[PDB]
Write a protein that binds this ligand. Structure first.
Ligand code: HEM
Ligand SMILES: CC[C@@H](C(=O)Nc1ccncc1)c1ccccc1
Length: 421
């Protein structure tokens, strides 16, 4: 019957899959450039209906699980798995502590790799806040390294089959087994050498036979799941926030002055990370607009819908793209330029473009972790920027993301040098 508009190219074995695995943003932009607000590309044996623009995005984000389901939209997660405002102050204090612990051995000056640093830091902030400080204290660099391998195991080939015999998938499975072993060791460690946390709660549950209900494997899967949403997103966002501050010294200087003035009231990071830090918040908003951690959002249609005359049927993959929508020229003047001022009271481009400023989604599925993520950035930089001065150790334009996996991560090198203030 009727065929939806299809983007050019995709003449490879799996259609546009190979291009999606190399330059997904370019592919999605070409879909919009050639077809408009509703266009398709072929992801192996699956047609993806890519929606963009306010009108189409509104349909996407206002749709409940009854119309567009996310349940089976991400097959790459199956092998991997196998927030209260009142607690926010406590989490801010926890994050401050974790950052100070991470930079405790920095000394007077040195060099760091952003991916390595923030990936490890966010493993500690996430585990400490979500599972418990007790659990985080039993973790070290090994956990972060293994967790990284899990994220690297999200090749788009998962849309063909999540268990293909490729190196990244093999490393993904090996990494998960390694995490189970680490968790099993922690459990055994508590038996021999007794504030209780989530792990203690799970260990205490008994089966209908008196035996422990949960195995190290089941517990590990729960913990992986609890930490996955916020890890790669917060890690990447922290890295890009620092990169953009260094790329734009005027913003860097403004944030520094602001931080010094604000903390002059003598209140802690747990107080200030939950309150306005204007310049930093606008730099963060702009960083998220330009470098949204999730470049594409997927759904599986559960019924028949029509968007601008185009028909969507049950079973069809439907997607929205923060990467593309966040840069629509009509909605964001000079979309490729770093302009924190676009979020100040006069313009408020994030609030005005309810359906296209979507680094945190919109509508019914709006990010429930956004408040936590924003607080975390404020807490992290409140510490880092007041303690140290940062400079780029490589050309500004050489910092870039690796888009070869569904989980976007910073490519290396991403070297930065620091010196005590
Ligand atoms: C900078 C960090 C983060 C970014 C950029 C981000 C982005 C997003 C986006 C784009 C959506 C919409 C997804 C969709 O419509 O398919 C979303 C939803 C959501 N996020 Fe995040 N997120 C971040 C951190 C977190 C954290 C820390 C948590 C965990 C506490 C989290 C939990 C969720 C949940 C549960 C939803 C769905 C809410 C619902 O369906 O009602 N996010 N996030
Ligand atoms: C579970 C991983 C999944 C996701 O929903 N992540 C997610 C992260 C933060 N907040 C909400 C969802 C995803 C989707 C596309 C690309 C990479 C990973």
């Amino acid at each position: 019957a009727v065929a939806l508009p299809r983007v050019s190219g995709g003449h490879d074995e799996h259609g546009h899959l190979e291009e999606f695995r190399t330059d997904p943003i370019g592919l999605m932009q070409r879909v919009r450039d050639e077809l408009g607000d509703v266009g398709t590309f072929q992801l192996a044996g699956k047609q993806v209906v890519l929606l963009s623009g306010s009108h189409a995005n509104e349909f996407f984000f206002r749709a409940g699980d009854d119309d567009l389901d996310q349940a089976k939209a991400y097959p790459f997660m199956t092998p991997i798995f196998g927030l209260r405002g009142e607690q926010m102050k406590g989490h801010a204090a926890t994050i401050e502590d974790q950052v100070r612990r991470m930079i405790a051995d920095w000394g007077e000056a040195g060099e760091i790799d952003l991916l390595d640093f923030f990936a490890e830091l966010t493993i500690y902030t996430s585990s400490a806040c979500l599972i418990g400080k007790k659990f985080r204290d039993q973790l070290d660099g090994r956990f972060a390294k293994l967790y990284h391998e899990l994220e690297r195991g999200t090749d788009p080939l998962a849309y063909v089959d999540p268990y293909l015999p490729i190196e990244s998938f093999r490393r993904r499975d090996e990494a998960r087994n390694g995490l189970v072993a680490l968790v099993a060791d922690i459990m055994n460690g508590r038996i021999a050498n007794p504030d209780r946390d989530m792990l203690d709660v799970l260990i205490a549950v008994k089966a209908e036979t008196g035996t422990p209900r949960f195995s190290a494997d089941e517990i590990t899967g729960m913990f992986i799941s609890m930490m996955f949403a916020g890890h790669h997103t917060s890690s990447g966002t922290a890295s890009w926030t620092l990169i953009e501050l260094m790329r734009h010294r005027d913003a860097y200087a403004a944030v520094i002055d602001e931080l010094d003035e604000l903390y002059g009231d003598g209140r802690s990071v747990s107080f200030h990370a939950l309150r306005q830090i204007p310049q930093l918040e606008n730099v963060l908003k702009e960083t998220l607009r330009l470098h949204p951690p999730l470049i594409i959002l997927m759904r599986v249609a559960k019924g028949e819908f029509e968007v601008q005359g185009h028909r969507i049927h049950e079973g069809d993959l439907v997607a929205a793209s923060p990467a593309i929508s966040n840069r629509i020229p009509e909605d964001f003047p000079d979309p490729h330029d770093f302009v924190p001022a676009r979020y100040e009271q006069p313009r408020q481009e994030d609030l005005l473009n309810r359906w296209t400023w979507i680094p945190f989604g919109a509508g019914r599925h709006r990010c429930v972790g956004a408040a936590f993520a924003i607080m975390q950035i404020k807490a992290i930089f409140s510490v880092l920027l007041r303690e140290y001065e940062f400079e780029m150790a490589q050309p500004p334009e050489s910092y870039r993301n690796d888009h070869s996996k569904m989980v976007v991560q910073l490519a290396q090198p991403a070297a930065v040098r620091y010196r005590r203030r």
